């Protein structure tokens, strides 16, 4: 009906997508063998959106799995939900990109994209009515930042009348797991801002903070952080594959949250989050969900929203639940925090209501939000890039593969224009 193609690049994109294909398989009641074992029939009426039918009742996921280093695909098949992925969808190279944007884009990631494009185009024609693309990667690496932005470029020039929903794991200063990623961050937002319509910035420091103070777990491994991300992955589009009373697809979110062709950088959220030891003492109510969507503690990006002003906010609700309490409290948070929203546009909040909550919960709410506090997210990368390009360091790895030094100046120039426009409209 409205099919979404999922693309996975980089090691971070492969791990999150492996968690993403696990949650929606649990939501639709699909065992790791490939059959369907559920109770309600509503999980079967809308099944072609995320899964493809095969003979014998076997369901296969419509996804593309790409990475030059074949290290992570051995772990993907060895995981709990790894038998369902198609071996024709496992496209890999021979040598890793080595944390270099040059090798990931123009030398080693330049001949594998022919093989990636034929799998993507084959799965595109298999769909009945294509709805768009969602992709996951990391900006701080070589394969995900390199081939991800390459694949964004090559698909946008071939499918113009579609949408791109990018879930990018942006680097953090204190959780800096690389020393060269200022180069890769600046050289990927050049390709991101011109060929994407909706981009979700995810940080690791925000997720480590949430699992400490909100969930209260002392061992937050990557098998848990990807679960928090995968909740927002499955909650953004829950009105596309389930009934409700006020439905909203990804294009309706795009036209309600993107007023300008360059102001399309978001900040996600998910807020029925409780610890195990405090489940008994909390009332699961619409007022308590509304309270904890909007605080700075629950945002999945390392930015304080109170240092800036929101432009647009959208909330997607799930569950059998009222509407006056939704409309009053979304109006109440606008009236109380009047200084936290810009005054030149009214009704900044979009609401969508569904019918089916996820398994093991009563009601859910997914938060997405455009804000001008992403200036602090990109100002740090600016100062990192300027102080690092000033002495021309970490550069022979880039000029030894074909690119001139002028592209570094253009990436800083594009990004300086991006922080000019948000400050102008704040």
């Amino acid at each position: 009906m409205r099919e979404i193609v999922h693309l996975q690049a980089g090691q971070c994109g492969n791990q999150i997508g492996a968690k993403f294909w696990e949650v929606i398989s649990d939501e639709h009641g699909i065992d790791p063998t490939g059959t369907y074992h559920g109770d309600s029939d509503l999980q079967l009426e809308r099944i072609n959106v995320y899964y493809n039918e095969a003979t014998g009742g076997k369901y296969v996921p419509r996804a593309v799995l790409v990475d030059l280093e074949p290290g992570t695909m051995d772990s993907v098949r060895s995981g709990p939900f790894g038998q369902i992925f198609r071996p024709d969808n496992f496209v890999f190279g021979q040598s890793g990109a080595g944390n270099n944007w040059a090798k990931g884009h123009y030398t080693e990631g330049a001949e594998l994209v022919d093989s990636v494009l034929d799998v993507v185009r084959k799965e595109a024609e298999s769909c009945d009515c294509l709805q768009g693309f969602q992709l996951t990667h990391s900006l701080g690496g070589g394969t995900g930042s390199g081939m991800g932005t390459l694949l964004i470029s090559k698909i946008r020039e071939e499918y113009p009348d579609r949408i791109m929903n990018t879930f990018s794991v942006v680097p953090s200063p204190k959780v800096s797991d690389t020393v060269v990623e200022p180069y890769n961050a600046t050289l990927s937002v050049h390709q991101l801002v011109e060929n994407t319509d909706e981009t979700y910035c995810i940080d690791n420091e925000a997720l480590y903070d949430i699992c400490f103070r909100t969930l209260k777990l002392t061992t937050p491994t990557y098998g848990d952080l990807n679960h928090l991300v995968s909740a927002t992955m499955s909650g953004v589009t829950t009105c596309l594959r389930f009934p409700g009373q006020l439905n909203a697809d990804l294009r309706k979110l795009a036209v309600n949250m993107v007023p300008f062709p360059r102001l399309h950088f978001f900040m996600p959220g998910f807020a029925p989050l409780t610890s195990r030891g405090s489940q008994q003492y909390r009332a699961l109510t619409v007022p308590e969900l509304t309270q904890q969507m909007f605080d700075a503690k629950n945002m999945m990006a390392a930015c304080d929203p109170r240092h800036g002003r929101y432009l647009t906010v959208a909330a997607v609700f799930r569950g059998r639940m009222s509407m006056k309490e939704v409309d009053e409290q979304m109006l109440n948070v606008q009236n109380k925090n009047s200084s936290y929203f810009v005054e030149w546009i009214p009704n900044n909040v979009k609401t969508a209501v569904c019918d089916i909550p996820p398994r093991g919960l009563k009601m859910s709410a997914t938060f997405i939000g455009n804000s001008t506090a992403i200036q602090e997210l990109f100002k740090r990368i600016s100062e990192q890039f300027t102080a690092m390009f000033r002495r021309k360091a970490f550069l022979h790895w880039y000029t030894g593969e074909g690119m001139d030094e002028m592209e570094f100046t253009e990436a800083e120039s594009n990004m300086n224009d991006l922080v000019s426009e948000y400050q102008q409209y704040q």
């Binding site: 079967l44 072609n48 493809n52 039918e53 095969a54 003979t55 009742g57």
Partner: peptide, 23 residues
């Protein structure tokens, strides 16, 4: 309270002798 289509392949295909009502 205090007191207490089944398949995409089978829906687009295998429709020789069966109608939409028969499936």
């Amino acid at each position: 309270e205090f007191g207490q289509g089944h398949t995409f392949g089978h829906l687009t295909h295998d429709a020789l002798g069966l109608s939409t009502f028969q499936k």
